[PDB]
Amino acid sequence: DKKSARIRRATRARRKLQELGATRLVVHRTPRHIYAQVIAPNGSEVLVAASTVEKAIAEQLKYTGNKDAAAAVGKAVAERALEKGIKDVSFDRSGFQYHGRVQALADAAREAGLQF
Amino acid sequence: GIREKIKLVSSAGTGHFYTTTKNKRTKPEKLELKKFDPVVRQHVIYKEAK
Amino acid sequence: MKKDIHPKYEEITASCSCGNVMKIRSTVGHDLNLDVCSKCHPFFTGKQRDVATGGRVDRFNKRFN
Amino acid sequence: AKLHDYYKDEVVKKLMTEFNYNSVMQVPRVEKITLNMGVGEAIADKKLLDNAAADLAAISGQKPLITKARKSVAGFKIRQGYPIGCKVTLRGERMWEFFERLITIAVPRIRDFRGLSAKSFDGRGNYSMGVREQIIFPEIDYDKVDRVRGLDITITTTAKSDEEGRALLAAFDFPFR
Amino acid sequence: RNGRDSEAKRLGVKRFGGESVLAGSIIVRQRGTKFHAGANVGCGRDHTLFAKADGKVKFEVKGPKNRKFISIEAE
Amino acid sequence: MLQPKRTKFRKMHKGRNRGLAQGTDVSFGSFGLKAVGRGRLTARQIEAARRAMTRAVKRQGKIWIRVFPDKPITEKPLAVRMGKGKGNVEYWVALIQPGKVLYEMDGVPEELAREAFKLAAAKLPIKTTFVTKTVM
RNA sequence: UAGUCCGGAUUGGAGUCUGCAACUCGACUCCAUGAAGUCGGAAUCGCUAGUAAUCGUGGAUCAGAAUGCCACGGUGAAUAC
RNA sequence: GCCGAGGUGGUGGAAUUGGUAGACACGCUACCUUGAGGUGGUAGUGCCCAAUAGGGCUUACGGGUUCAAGUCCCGUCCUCGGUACCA
RNA sequence: UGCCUGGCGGCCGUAGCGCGGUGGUCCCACCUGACCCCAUGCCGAACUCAGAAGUGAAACGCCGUAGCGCCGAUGGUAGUGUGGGGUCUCCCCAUGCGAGAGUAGGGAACUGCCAGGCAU
RNA sequence: UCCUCCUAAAGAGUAACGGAGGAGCACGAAGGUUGGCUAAUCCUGGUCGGACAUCAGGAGGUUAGUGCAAUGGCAUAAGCCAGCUUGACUGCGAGCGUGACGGCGCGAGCAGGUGCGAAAGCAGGUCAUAGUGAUCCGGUGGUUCUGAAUGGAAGGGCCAUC
RNA sequence: CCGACUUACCAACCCGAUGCAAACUGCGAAUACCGGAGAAUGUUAUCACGGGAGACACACGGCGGGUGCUAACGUCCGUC
């Protein structure tokens, strides 16, 4: 149910984002990890992905499921996407409320050089 | 039917007004309604009038 | 909880008149002195005592020899 | 407070020893306790519902939510969106302390008490009892009293059967005639 | 007591499969959404579907409810 | 007389009677009275045939009617001109296609069944036949 | 100053006495209960002084069974243009 | 046949602005007055559940609408008033 | 290269339910508490934060079952365009198209992009 | 006169004193945006409380709901709730649809100035389809546009509106 | 007050099997319609603009219907 009620809040914004054709920055939040993916204009293939389940990100932070890990994941996905070059990305909160951790991920993506 | 015709008149640079309808027995309250004025080209406060 | 709208809810010491003392978070505004307790109640101990429900031949014999 | 730690030792250990639970998560947990006051006579004046709300606020620790009517009924002269009942849903530690005051203090005071009959489970371990007059809780002054103004408390347990929830509530020494 | 009927309001599919449209052309007039908007197709305030780009019209069934969608291929 | 309790609309169109019937198998009972020709039966004729049949068998066995009218038929009064609306609903008919089992009976011998179906078929306007149920 | 420490009907229990016998259907006593009733509609009655009003006592009938009937006293008015 | 109006206690009847009806005048019942009737005066007076507080059933019938129908809508029965003409 | 697990899809019931069994090193879920972010028309239920003692109960995934749901032939039937015929308010013929329902049967999906752990 | 369904023969349209129902409005929120949520009806349990009010759980899955008739729609909700608001904004408008015409409708985008949102974005009224009358004549406000010798003014024009 | 005993009383919802519908539809043609490509044929048969019109009482026959009585050389539509 808790998983099921969230996909509605996803399904609204995902539909119009795929209608526009914008590159979707998808975030995912669990109680102990956090994930980010930069998915193509078609919405099938990803470009990059960064999370706390990556080893090299987890080697440098204390807890894998709080705000600082989210900020490190955001700056990692921003620096990797800027090494690729994805300049205009549109963020999607994926059914999660904005303020808690995906605010930290979104902001650390923004001030690492990603314009949204 | 029961909606009276009223107009709403500009505050700054009144060479303009809009016109709307309002029910007197439910709402005796005023409109202020910050609409656009084409004369002064800004969004001004408008006021209820006959 | 929503901060100021709730009534005060403080730790008091209730004084059970069966002999007992209990710290209880409550709302009464004093140290409440209750009469009977969960201890020493007739239903809780077993002193509920429903009467015989038919003692007629008992009553006739305690009357008459 | 008290009944939580008494649960966390004795109730889980006894429902472990007499019910086959390979995991401790299968043991039923009393999850929430709601006090409902279906006032209902506030179709004439809502001073009465306003008094009943403060009565529930004195009984529990939470400010009660007023419940408006769901569908319009002309059998009882009610309107859609008329506030006709009052409720508290209390969960967690405040529910544990309300459970303390309900068992240790309140249920001796039901004034010719004969034991709450256990057949009031609805099918999935949730209990419901009806307290007929409000003065059985000692938070009421009784110098102030206006009406009788009872309530009903329904306990939601995570039990799936009636016998599991019955053994759960009996492990906290419910009267159970 | 009978005898009243409104004027028929000319609804229906105006442009069918494979037809070349310009942008802004009306494809379907309808009351509800019998057809839903897809790529390069906009939905009006009375649920009119119109060409938001110039191409060819395409009808599909999509989604988990087997619903009709109208797409436009930019030719 | 059989007519629908609480029908949706009071009057309906004339329509046509093309096609072959759907209820061709005798399902409920053993013997059946089946329709050979097209037409329509009013509820008066259905009840006349039913009374004649159950009087012919002396109230033994079981009788099923398999057609129900559900179609209102109007008339205009005499010395009333054409126009001014649809006429008032007078009576209800059931439309009958070739091959429709109109009646069934079970719990009787075959010759009493055949003779009762003859005495009941005398009241009906359409041409009929005697049929028997068949396995598969 | 309350349906109240007013009211004492009703009913549950335990008794006592008379009497062949207290169920139909007695009187009383105890314990408990604590109903209507908050001065009474249209109407209507008695009384002129030791009277009305009020308080108690006694007798006949009678095994038991008076709030009735017949008697006795205590206190004791108002009003008669 | 066509149009308009009506049907509500035992009666005459007011409620025809959806917000749980019979209000008023008769009649009836009870009491008083009277030698006794009538008049007169006080109190009841739509039907069934309990001795009550109250609830069920009730507007010609049947059905729909809504939360709710005497009330608006439809159909049917009965009764009024008007028309049913030109050849 | 093979298993799992998660995210985004493709597709939209041959893909959904029921019934049975199975998983916790990871991943995930339940979980723990609420100085603080934030939240409740009451309530840390949810939303949110700070976390890791337990459990795989529930959920989720996987596997097995046809009891349903679903798909679905070949024939035949209905209907019908065109041109003729009648006993013509209904059909027949020549010819072209040809269902729906039902039947034999199929069937508890398949797969792409990436990420993590495992044995290789 | 207008709207919805059928007649209407699977594009559109299509008559009758053919079969059925509605409209002559409402709403500064019932419009905009952001965030969130998901019914009807039954069963069980529980103070008064009882077929039917409030509570709790289960079944069921949209049989509900839509400001108002019917149809088409709606879960990403167009349904329900709360925060902030005035886009119920001005000038246009590629292109279409529908009418004999008068007319009626849909519209991406552009300029100016805003509202909500962190942002992508969305908003130039409402789930859509009824809620409506041409012209003349005059009323009011603004704009030197004209203004009968000249300067004004009257009166016309234009724009908003009755 | 419980509540027992019954019955040629009726019985919703569900199950199993029949039908019916212009205003029912989880299915669904043939034709017709819209568009594109090609060949042959056709006295441009097509569209636009201008000059001049007439006509706007239709009739029957077939097919699909409404109404009427699946009456009418009836009436009202669609199409030839």
Curated annotation (Swiss-Prot), chain F:
GO-annotated biological processes: cytoplasmic translation; ribosomal large subunit assembly
This protein's UniProt keywords: Hydroxylation, Methylation, Ribonucleoprotein, Ribosomal protein, RNA-binding, rRNA-binding, tRNA-binding
GO molecular function per UniProt: rRNA binding; structural constituent of ribosome; tRNA binding
InterPro entries in the record: Ribosomal_uL16, Ribosomal_uL16_bact-type, Ribosomal_uL16_CS, Ribosomal_uL16_dom, Ribosomal_uL16_sf
Annotated TM spans: none
Modified residues ((3R)-3-hydroxyarginine): R81
Domain of life: Bacteria
PTMs per UniProt: Is hydroxylated on Arg-81 by RoxA. The modification is nearly suppressed when E.coli is grown in anoxia.
Stored Gene3D superfamilies: Ribosomal protein L10e/L16 (3.90.1170.10)
Positions bearing N-methylmethionine: M1
A GO CC term attached to the entry: cytoplasm
Pfam family, one: Ribosomal_L16
Family under the similarity heading: Belongs to the universal ribosomal protein uL16 family.
NCBIfam families assigned to the protein according to its UniProt record, in alphabetical order: rplP_bact (TIGR01164)
Assembly: Part of the 50S ribosomal subunit. Cross-links to the A and P site tRNAs. Interacts with assembly factor DarP(YjgA).
Job description of the protein: Binds directly to 23S ribosomal RNA and is located at the A site of the peptidyltransferase center. It contacts the A and P site tRNAs. One of the last ribosomal proteins to be assembled in the 50S subunit. The simultaneous presence of uL16 and bL36 probably triggers ObgE's GTPase activity and eventual dissociation from the mature 50S ribosmal subunit. It has an essential role in subunit assembly.
UniProt protein name: Large ribosomal subunit protein uL16
Annotated source species: Escherichia coli (strain K12)
Taxon lineage: Bacteria, Pseudomonadati, Pseudomonadota, Gammaproteobacteria, Enterobacterales
Gene behind the chain: rplP
